[PDB]
Amino acid sequence: FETVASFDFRDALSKASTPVTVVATNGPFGLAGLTCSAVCSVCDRPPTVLLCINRKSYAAGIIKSNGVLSVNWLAAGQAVISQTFAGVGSVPMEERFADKGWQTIATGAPYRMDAAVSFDCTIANIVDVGSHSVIFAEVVARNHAEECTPLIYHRRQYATTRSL
């Protein structure tokens, strides 16, 4: 079989819906983070998530060298955080974390305490596939947030959820 055109793969996926997260890290290689929707739960023992991130991202090599990361699922009111971490405004990495709502829990990675969900993690496995590194991380702590109406991304813009 021949694979579909890269153009067709991306266009088709624009019609899917995803949550929006920020993946962040800190440690001796410095502070970095980026907006990521290619994230999912893998297994619950040991508890493990994965995230796929373009090796061309400035955050990629810093995350992999720090060895720890957080995954922060954003709430519907947090689209400006998603924009910041996607490179809009070109905010310097460190500056992205200036707001007091970013703290640490266990690893030293920045955790967004009012995200719908925030997992603090250590990297367990990295598999490089095409342009991206698929990073498997084990979850060592989490936040305890009240508001969790989701920020969603769909056909190239933000959305949230509705009943039905």
Added chain:
Amino acid sequence: FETVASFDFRDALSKASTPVTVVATNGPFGLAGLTCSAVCSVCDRPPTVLLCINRKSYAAGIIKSNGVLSVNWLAAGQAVISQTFAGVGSVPMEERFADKGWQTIATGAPYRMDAAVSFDCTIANIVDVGSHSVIFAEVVARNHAEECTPLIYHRRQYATTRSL
């Protein structure tokens, strides 16, 4: 660092949102499918997605031996399909594909033609983590899909999107 309790991990994840897909297959080993939310896009060259499925399931066994599969991102009106393929109502595996919206495209896997996105795929690699196989699949065809607001899962209920 100690990893969080399994119960605590599933708990937090209920507060995150996901898309809802059906993963299906057919071939020399038979017809099978199940509902899968742990799916994501990996890279666009070669166009590759991944999905995480428990190795204990009837469907996992057949998918892996057929070597081909489709991933079908469901639309907002299709919660009944998601329920069927999660085992709600105990519909026998092979009776699950009655509906005519299921057609063949390239590999012989059944593709849901009215799904928001339907990818027909060949398995490229499998990474085992805990109880799950993370299956990497290369996309060799797609449904050229009519417009569709997607099915989302959040807080143990189905939902769809709206605007901010």
